[PDB]
Design an enzyme around this catalytic site. Structure first.
Site, PDB file in Angstrom:
ATOM      1  N   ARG A  74       0.840  -1.185   0.000  1.00 25.62           N
ATOM      2  CA  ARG A  74       0.000   0.000   0.000  1.00 25.62           C
ATOM      3  C   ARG A  74       0.880   1.241   0.000  1.00 25.62           C
ATOM      4  NH1 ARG A  74      -0.969   3.519   4.715  1.00 25.62           N
ATOM      5  NH2 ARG A  74      -0.118   1.584   5.592  1.00 25.62           N
TER       6      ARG A  74
HETATM    7  N1  LIG Z   1      -9.282  -0.544  -8.515  1.00 23.16           N
HETATM    8  C1  LIG Z   1      -8.729  -1.309  -7.547  1.00 23.16           C
HETATM    9  N2  LIG Z   1      -9.484  -2.171  -6.840  1.00 23.16           N
HETATM   10  C2  LIG Z   1      -8.954  -2.939  -5.873  1.00 23.16           C
HETATM   11  N3  LIG Z   1      -7.658  -2.921  -5.530  1.00 23.16           N
HETATM   12  C3  LIG Z   1      -6.786  -2.102  -6.159  1.00 23.16           C
HETATM   13  C4  LIG Z   1      -7.286  -1.231  -7.228  1.00 23.16           C
HETATM   14  N4  LIG Z   1      -6.227  -0.532  -7.676  1.00 23.16           N
HETATM   15  C5  LIG Z   1      -5.145  -0.927  -6.952  1.00 23.16           C
HETATM   16  N5  LIG Z   1      -5.478  -1.869  -6.050  1.00 23.16           N
HETATM   17  C6  LIG Z   1      -4.581  -2.531  -5.075  1.00 23.16           C
HETATM   18  O1  LIG Z   1      -5.160  -3.763  -4.639  1.00 23.16           O
HETATM   19  C7  LIG Z   1      -5.200  -3.811  -3.209  1.00 23.16           C
HETATM   20  C8  LIG Z   1      -6.437  -4.508  -2.660  1.00 23.16           C
HETATM   21  O2  LIG Z   1      -6.199  -4.665  -1.264  1.00 23.16           O
HETATM   22  P1  LIG Z   1      -7.344  -4.459  -0.161  1.00 23.16           P
HETATM   23  O3  LIG Z   1      -8.693  -4.519  -0.832  1.00 23.16           O
HETATM   24  O4  LIG Z   1      -6.975  -3.231   0.632  1.00 23.16           O
HETATM   25  O5  LIG Z   1      -7.159  -5.754   0.779  1.00 23.16           O
HETATM   26  P2  LIG Z   1      -8.079  -7.040   0.530  1.00 23.16           P
HETATM   27  O6  LIG Z   1      -7.948  -7.285  -0.963  1.00 23.16           O
HETATM   28  O7  LIG Z   1      -7.469  -8.103   1.402  1.00 23.16           O
HETATM   29  O8  LIG Z   1      -9.444  -6.585   0.962  1.00 23.16           O
HETATM   30  C9  LIG Z   1      -5.152  -2.370  -2.737  1.00 23.16           C
HETATM   31  O9  LIG Z   1      -4.408  -2.248  -1.525  1.00 23.16           O
HETATM   32  C10 LIG Z   1      -4.485  -1.619  -3.869  1.00 23.16           C
HETATM   33  O10 LIG Z   1      -3.112  -1.384  -3.555  1.00 23.16           O
END
Ligand SMILES: Nc1ncnc2c1ncn2[C@@H]1O[C@H](COP(=O)(O)OP(=O)(O)O)[C@@H](O)[C@H]1O
Ligand SMILES: Nc1ncnc2c1ncn2[C@@H]1O[C@H](COP(=O)(O)OP(=O)(O)OP(=O)(O)O)[C@@H](O)[C@H]1O
Ligand SMILES: Nc1ncnc2c1ncn2[C@@H]1O[C@H](COP(=O)(O)OP(=O)(O)O)[C@@H](O)[C@H]1O
Ligand SMILES: [Mg+2]
Ligand SMILES: [Mg+2]
Ligand SMILES: [Mg+2]
Lengths: 27, 54, 467, 484, 470, 138, 138
Positions: free
Chosen positions: D348
């Protein structure tokens, strides 16, 4: 045939993530 | 002459590839059976250990 | 000291109740009334004036009520220069029928590990004359060296090679601790060392002491013999201040013995079934086998991997306690390459460009890289064929195979097996030869010419011979 | 002193009879001087885990209540000292002059006391500081196999912290804490030697729980170090902690619980291993201004057998951490050292926890490397120079740029310089095996001649158009003069 | 009230002996003498007038013999309109440092499930604006939505985007239950809603209540925060006849927390290692979260998939409790498509040509079929080569890749991550665009034009920009 | 097989002790522990019914000792002890050529050699089906 | 799901008993035990909490008996016994096509054939997703 035997599916080559999957991805 | 040679070679090569795949899947099936049995045994052992500890 | 009656006998775990003065944990309790000394080691204070003990010999014939007398100290062994040339058991009794070991001082089996302020940081390269080791995974002087391998892969052959190439020339003393290995191997090594002069049966010129806990011994004994060899090594390290080479065989057997007694010691089994104290007891044993500021102990420990599986808790935990790690692979042995050292798995801590040298580092890394690329192309080869590869890729495959063959080396202890005389290759020759192979100077030579050869000169000579 | 009698002492577990006023999780002192922690309060006995060898303890020993829940001597007097799990100095440099003791099991900061991650936690590694940036207060997992370089990454970050610590501003100063769990004493000593030859020990507290140290000590070590970091975090200072081998803490918990007769679960790890690791990592946070504005950064290390990140403890720790740095053996033996799998390594962004100057080149580097990874995974070249060969050459150039040696952390401006050189296409013509030589030579040339440029980059925090023009001149001139 | 005494403190399981009448199971016990409030919920009547209780906070400091009172009711939380804009704990304590939550009505976290005759049979459609969801797996108003996914796949980002798109627009109040999540994310959500206006610290127009138990909390607390949040939602459903939106993060933590305490509670481990009372407890929780005839509760629950194994018992059981499921595949996220919704795994009950309309159903099924055929073709590609397939195969592959790229949609909450401005696509535009791509009207456009775009109008417009920059 | 598991457990040791007579009395003996695998199964049964914690493949952790103590008794005694021999030919049945299994690897780690017989060769008519590549004698 | 485990355990038996009325009185009946796996899960919960010794996947050893004493009640009685029928259509949810799991194996062994449905066919246009090859009727 017998259901117990392991059955492959479409996309297995790419799902494996091996050399053949990478070759398909790059190609 | 070239086209016939190419087709014959392609047929032979694909046959050989199929044979190699057959050997590989035989080995992998043996490994799969061993691993499956191991997984069942391991979960059994975990459950038994949990029961006895109680 | 204190007399206790045997209350329970299960396997090697003897439950003794002492009327007064419970012996402290890890004390040596001697059973009274047996033809041969059966010493019990206090393991747990169960309570109700009862101590649970681990036997160091067979428990057959023990009866509930037999008296056991405390010694007041942990199991002690004869220690000193007199031990050199003599064979000892777990409890220290001489088993070479040469007479009692008249040492002036006796040391305890159990002792605390060297403290943090006593550890040494010096790292030097111990040339072994083995191509794979010296080039990819150089062995450190005074560091803990581990030989990982499965059943029948070359662990004891390799450790014999290390003894022949290093221990003979070593100016200091040495201790070979046989834990859970076939007795015939010990008899061979004993007579072999006698012939070589390392063990002299006439004058005190012997340079190696032997402690043996072979697989015939009960589980309790096999869990302490390594500590006995470690103690006799520790004396030479600290009191005499002389460098020692502690060769131990199948340290895994030490852990395996613990698992067998852990069940009878009333412990909830851990993963697989090993004892819950695997990491702690292994660390307690290993931490004592360390070079200190007083002296140095170069430890060559062979570690058996169950089912050729390195994720097993016993081999997996051992990795953290080793500076240099050599992993023999059965598949490499199947191809014929001996020694079966895995080029891409064996590691070392002195493989640093500021330590081993820039040239050596570059050569080793390049060899590993080309072998890794060949491994990456294995699947495509196995299915399609080498034909469906780039001519550049074919070069990598052709060169990598030559390197794999050249990694193989005839061994002096394997002359009676293969019929080929052993070749002790100096480090410089290994580095230069692998340089030449990597560059492409010997691409014309057949790959077979690189198999079971010494220096690259022998490889080219064999190539010409293959007319 | 309400005391008890040891009914049974076995494998470090003492079922003390008595201590009717003993607190749970409270330290107790044995007759021999060994200290233990009461964990299993039972109706008739108290299960105490001894923090040492249990041979001295025997049945009938008198156990005295210390009267306090287990705490560790805390403060800034521990900087430069190698301590154990209980805060006892093992460096032989003298008693630690700590005046404050903080409980090892304190709760983590709540929702309110925390603020968004802002400050960049530079590691000195090009790959980490460019493609997987780590901010202050962000828990990043250095996950990998054995002998992959996780400890190398951690120690390199530790050494990198020097250039800020020896400066003036206290905002950038980052005190470090290394918690060694299960590592042998020789390894810990080698780490300390590296730190004290790079003069990084002055700002580090090395908590050590080696294999010889008891399982309770190894279990307690991470919490001890975390509390020691919490000292700095709650006083407005910024701290970094590396829980080396948190997996070794899991096995210590497994031993402690099983010897305490607590029933086992998955892989015999006690069911609360998730909490064991969660309560530790959650403490790492970026405090808001009202709470001092301090931060605690955590870099846990997890060893994965055979690279199976789907194993129990690896998945547990992965879920907890903000991002994961994946180290793969195949990259290491393929030449990518450090072996960071930038494709799978995720972090992140830390709400813009990367300096603007780094961002400008890092975005394009990331996009180019992604495209290179997608296309150059065949090794079966047929014939598209404009499309593929152009892309894959740039990818190779950027990979060689990312390759970095050990114990040589680069300042962020120097990383910006080299990444600029590679990402602008200036090195596309350079030989793929000579890229590393160019990297070293260009770094030296910039540092010596154009040190003002580096100073400007660092001061501004952003590469402006004028600074970009200066960089253009520098790189072009040196590139032309690179090969005599 | 029948003051008990602690007899054992092992982990989070604390046993109390009541000399006077034993407290019934699920009642809340208060430990006296502690500086803070520690609530012990009765779990089992062990016997000899002793109750095995799971602590809702840390058990450090407890000493055998400490007096424990009985509240006489299951854990009661402040509930009402005054909880909006306030952060509360599992035991209903204000954790936002804004003073006591002054609600005139208190409700227990444990309650019976709605009856069968109270179940609603209507099925509407909720247009979130996401192309993948609205087309392939349309969400339903009042239905139970499930965001299945692994670690780092997009569950939290997707749920926050759903909050931004739906909850903000939705007039009815919402509840967020942060079950076993990162504390940092909780603070981020709290601050984001403050500036967004959903939570107003000054006025009383806040539209979202927050219940948080993070992973820092003990296992007992992490197993009841979901119950507290759903109790608040139930108040916003029964007492007030309004539509509510319950957003829970990582419901999996509810099941996992039980697994961390079952062994101490004295239960023989079930398969893999979960508690034997997995499905029963999960149903007891989930059945309460439904849209009764009195009111509607559109619930979006994030479900962590351990080790990306959907066959794992925890995600497997929750599948039956959810009307609409959206599974986030890591492999797609590795490809870059965000959101990483698996087109061939996500399902919705309202995906019925009678409900969504014939055109919608036909387009969705065509997309799924063409992607399946692409999956089939990839295996051929790996051996033959792309320059060996038939023109029909190449056409199918190209169209499938275009559709996969067009599935990706930039999110407003992901503007910080991607850098592209967030877009919201109407359902009609989604259907029209995917229908056009299936027909082939945009075959001439490059695949890149369809990646990270909104409507197909943005898709074609992007292609022109690339040509201008060519 | 009809005989009890304890009997199947003791049988190899009973046979070895009978040959130990010849070995100790200046005589040469050959002991063939056919189906040691089944002795391992019987010992596993005894241990599991004794509630001993199972290990890999459910085999008790002392299975290695079970075979080691038996096989070690086989030895060539020196002249001073009569010069007898107790040559031992244990048999282990692999499943699908699993020479990497627990009992097979255990017995290989004890024995001074192995004569690997292959089902492929046996069906191909090469009888005896000795795999010379893997067969070795120390 | 809200219903306690014993209720879920008894539901199939209650439904079968309701169906038997028609079969025993010359009326043809069909019963559909949807999610017979969930009934096995409820029985496992009851057994493990009752401390009944566990087995594979923690399912009690008598789970095969639990399912057999239910599916065997389905029968076509002869004319003398009324001539009624009780057709049974149990439903088992395999996990990733694991037809070798405990409950799937038990139910497959008990039943007189199966109708296997594949998600691949469902998204390939084949709706219903009946795999003709695996599906069989005794
Ligand atoms: N449009 C997007 N949707 C989802 N994730 C994204 C997107 N763009 C980048 N990412 C990356 O994918 C990661 C998804 O992690 P997160 O949703 O925070 O944890 P989890 O997937 O365990 O719920 C994000 O931290 C981000 O860095
Ligand atoms: N940047 C680097 N480039 C090249 N080699 C490196 C680099 N960093 C570390 N190494 C080498 O890699 C090897 C392993 O490194 P390291 O000790 O960090 O591994 P590890 O995974 O922490 O080990 P362990 O399993 O012992 O804890 C060492 O030989 C080290 O010198
Ligand atoms: N370097 C080598 N050269 C030739 N043969 C070898 C070599 N190393 C091992 N072998 C063969 O493989 C076998 C390995 O078994 P050994 O090393 O004696 O015990 P283990 O490897 O089980 O500890 C040897 O018996 C030998 O026949
Ligand atoms: Mg050997
Ligand atoms: Mg390390
Ligand atoms: Mg998340």
């Amino acid at each position: 045939d017998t259901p117990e035997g392991v059955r492959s599916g479409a996309g297995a080559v790419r799902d494996a993530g091996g050399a053949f999957g990478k070759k398909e991805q790059a190609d | 002459e070239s086209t016939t040679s190419e087709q014959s070679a392609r047929m032979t090569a694909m046959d050989n590839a199929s044979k190699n795949a057959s050997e590989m899947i035989d080995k992998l099936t043996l490994t799969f059976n061993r691993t499956r049995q191991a997984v069942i045994t391991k979960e059994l052992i975990e459950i038994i250990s949990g029961a006895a500890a109680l | 000291a204190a007399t206790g009656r045997i209350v329970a006998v299960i396997g090697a775990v003897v439950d003794v109740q002492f009327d007064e003065g419970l012996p402290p944990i890890l004390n040596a309790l001697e059973v009274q009334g047996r033809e041969t000394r059966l010493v019990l080691e206090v393991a747990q204070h169960l309570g109700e004036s009862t101590v649970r003990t681990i036997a160091m010999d067979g428990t057959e014939g023990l009866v509930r009520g037999q008296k056991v007398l405390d010694s007041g100290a942990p199991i002690k062994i004869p220690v000193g220069p007199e031990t050199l040339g003599r064979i000892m058991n777990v409890i220290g009794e001489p088993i070479d029928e040469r007479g009692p070991i008249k040492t002036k001082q006796f040391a305890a089996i159990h002792a605390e590990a060297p403290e943090f302020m006593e550890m040494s940081v010096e790292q030097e390269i111990l040339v072994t004359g083995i191509k794979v080791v010296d080039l990819l995974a150089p062995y450190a002087k005074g560091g803990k060296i581990g030989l990982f391998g499965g059943a029948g892969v070359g662990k004891t052959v390799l450790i014999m090679e290390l003894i022949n190439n290093v221990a003979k020339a070593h100016g200091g003393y040495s201790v070979f601790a046989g834990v859970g290995e076939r007795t015939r191997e010990g008899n061979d090594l004993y007579h072999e060392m006698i012939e070589s002069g390392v063990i002299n049966l006439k004058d005190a010129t012997s340079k190696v002491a032997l402690v043996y806990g072979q697989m015939n011994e009960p589980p309790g004994a096999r869990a302490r013999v390594a500590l006995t060899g470690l103690t006799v090594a520790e004396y030479f390290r600290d009191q005499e201040g002389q460098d020692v080479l502690l060769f131990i065989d199948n340290i895994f057997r030490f852990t395996q013995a613990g698992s067998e007694v852990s069940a009878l010691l009333g412990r909830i089994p851990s993963a697989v079934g090993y004892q819950p104290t695997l990491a702690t007891d292994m660390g307690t044993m290993q931490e004592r086998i360390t070079t200190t500021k007083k002296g140095s102990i170069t430890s060559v420990q062979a570690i058996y991997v169950p089912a050729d599986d390195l994720t097993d808790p016993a081999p997996a935990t051992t990795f953290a306690h080793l500076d240099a790690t050599t992993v023999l692979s059965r598949a490499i042995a199947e191809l014929g390459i001996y020694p079966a050292v895995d080029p891409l798995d064996s590691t070392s801590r002195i493989m640093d460009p500021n330590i081993v040298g820039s040239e050596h580092y570059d050569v080793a890394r390049g060899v590993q890289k080309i072998l890794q690329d060949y491994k990456s192309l294995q699947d495509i080869i196995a299915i399609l064929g080498m034909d469906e590869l780039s001519e550049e890729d074919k070069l990598t495959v052709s060169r990598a195979r030559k390197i794999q063959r050249f990694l193989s080396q005839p061994f002096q202890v394997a002359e009676v097996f293969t019929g080929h005389l052993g070749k002790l290759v100096p480090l410089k020759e290994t580095i230069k030869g692998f340089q030449q192979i990597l560059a492409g100077e010997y691409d014309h030579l057949p790959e077979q010419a690189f198999y079971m050869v010494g220096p690259i000169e022998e490889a080219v000579a064999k190539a010409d011979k293959l007319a | 002193e309400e005391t008890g009698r040891v009914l049974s002492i076995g494998d470090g577990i003492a079922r003390v009879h008595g201590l009717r006023n003993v607190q749970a999780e409270e330290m107790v002192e044995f007759s021999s001087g060994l200290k233990g922690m009461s964990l299993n309060l039972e109706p008739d006995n108290v299960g105490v885990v001894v923090f040492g060898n249990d041979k001295l303890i025997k049945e009938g020993d008198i156990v005295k209540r210390t009267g306090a829940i287990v705490d560790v001597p805390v403060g800034e007097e521990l900087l430069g000292r190698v301590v154990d799990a209980l805060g006892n100095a093992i460096d032989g440099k003298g008693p630690i002059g700590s005046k404050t003791r903080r409980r090892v099991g304190l709760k983590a900061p709540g929702i309110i006391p925390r603020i968004s991650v802002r400050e960049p936690m530079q590691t000195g590694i090009k790959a980490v500081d460019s493609l997987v940036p780590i901010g202050r207060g962000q828990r990043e997992l250095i996950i990998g196999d054995r002998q992959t370089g996780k400890t190398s990454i951690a120690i390199d970050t530790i050494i990198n912290q020097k250039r800020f610590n020896d400066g003036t501003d206290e905002k950038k100063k980052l005190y470090c804490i290394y918690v060694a769990i299960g590592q042998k004493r020789s390894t810990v000593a080698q780490l300390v030697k590296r730190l004290t030859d790079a003069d990084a020990m002055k700002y580090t507290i090395v908590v050590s729980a080696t294999a010889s140290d008891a399982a309770p000590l190894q279990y307690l070590a991470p919490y001890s170090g975390c509390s020691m970091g919490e000292y700095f975090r709650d006083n407005g200072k910024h701290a970094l902690i590396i829980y080396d081998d948190l997996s070794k803490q899991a096995v210590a918990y497994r031993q402690m619980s099983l010897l305490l007769r607590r029933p086992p679960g998955r892989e015999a790890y006690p069911g609360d291993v998730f909490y064991l690791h969660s309560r530790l990592l959650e403490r790492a946070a970026k405090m808001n201004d009202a709470f001092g504005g301090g931060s605690l950064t955590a870099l846990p290390v997890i060893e994965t057998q055979a690279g199976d990140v789907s194993a129990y403890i690896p998945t547990n720790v992965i879920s907890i951490t903000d991002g994961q740095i994946f180290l793969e053996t195949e990259l290491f033996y393929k030449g990518i050292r450090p072996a960071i799998n930038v494709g799978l390594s995720v972090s992140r962004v830390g709400s813009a926890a990367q300096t603007r100057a780094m961002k400008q080149v890092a975005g394009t580097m990331k996009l180019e490397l992604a495209q290179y990874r997608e296309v150059a995974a065949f090794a079966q070249f047929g014939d598209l120079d404009a499309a593929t060969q152009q892309l894959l050459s740039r990818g190779v150039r950027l990979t060689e740029l990312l390759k970095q040696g050990q114990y040589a952390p680069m300042a962020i401006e120097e990383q910006v310089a080299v990444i600029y050189a590679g990402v602008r296409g200036y090195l596309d013509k350079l030989e793929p095996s000579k890229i590393t030589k160019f990297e070293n030579a260009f770094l030296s040339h910039v540092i010596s001649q154009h040190q003002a440029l580096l100073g400007k980059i660092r001061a501004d925090g952003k590469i402006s158009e004028e600074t970009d023009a200066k960089l253009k001149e520098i790189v072009t001139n040196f590139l032309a003069g690179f090969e005599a």
